[PDB]
Write a protein that binds this DNA or RNA. Sequence first.
DNA 1: GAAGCCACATCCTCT
DNA 2: AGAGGATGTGGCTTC
Lengths: 118, 130, 118
Amino acid sequence: PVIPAAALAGYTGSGPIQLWQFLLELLTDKSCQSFISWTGDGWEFKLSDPDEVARRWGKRKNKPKMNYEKLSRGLRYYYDKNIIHKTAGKRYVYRFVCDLQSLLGYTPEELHAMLDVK
Amino acid sequence: PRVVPDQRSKFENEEFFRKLSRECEIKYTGFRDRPHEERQTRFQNACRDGRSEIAFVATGTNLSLQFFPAPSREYVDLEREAGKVYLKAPMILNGVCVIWKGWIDLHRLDGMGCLEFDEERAQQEDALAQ
Amino acid sequence: GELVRTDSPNFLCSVLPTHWRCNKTLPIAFKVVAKGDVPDGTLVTVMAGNDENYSAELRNATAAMKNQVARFNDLRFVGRSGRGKSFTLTITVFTNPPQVATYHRAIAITVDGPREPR
DNA sequence: GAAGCCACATCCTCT
DNA sequence: AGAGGATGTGGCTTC
């Protein structure tokens, strides 16, 4: 649970947390490295256990019937808004394309280090 | 009814035409979802083809313009100003023969313009209908 | 079906909902009827705007005249008309010279459109 | 409070 | 597996 990714992204409490912000929050929590993690390339990440990520998302949003099939459509909505793109050819691998550096204040190498990514 | 009987008067009266009889601000309504450059090369080239899409920002009334008499030259001028483009195009708006005239910044893609009765077309038209 | 006079003495059109959702397919295909004689194949085109949006984003706003009828295949409004405010249609029939017919307060477009009181 | 704007949550069709 | 259309739903804001 390193830097407060949720906050650095803009989240303040007002209104639900957005899917991309929640994911980012999971990527900055060393304990979640099992189901979600950085691929070690820029801001690209992989959902190793989509069903798990979906549950926690379902839980955090209070939509118990949630699931990856649905969570992904959420991500797909970002393609156009340039927040997160899909790593073509790599299963469950997406990438933040917004300016996470400016928000988090750290760079990919920096964060990967702090999070001890292997 | 290709045109309205009181063609002459319907332009003199009626708020519609009236509100659009002065140097009202106008703008190029095209490819708004595209880079400014593109809208520039597009808007101008398209003018060289004698056509353009413009609306009166104020009233928000859009209009498709065709710069020809009822490959152009005087209907679409780019000499009367170093950067602007003076245009002109007739039409039968709501049963009233009129002529749209105005200019636009070849950069800011906007300017001024307005409408003015077209005694000729109106008269000729009144004929075909009798 | 049922037509309606426009601000031009030479053209009529189908009826459009008073309030509708944006980018939402219409309930009744919009068509433009020409009282006078208009050569088949003639292009017809609609635009919209108001004192809040000078030019509404549209979709499939073009149709060709056929038997005095220009049937617009899936016309859609994407630009919003504003709270309370509506759009002023500008139907254009390309003849020599072109004939333009307006239609004030024709349709109100919003993000949700018609919604049941929450 | 209605009416707006947002960000999904649900469902589904196609490749 | 993944893209994207269609439409309903709850949070928050503005008129």
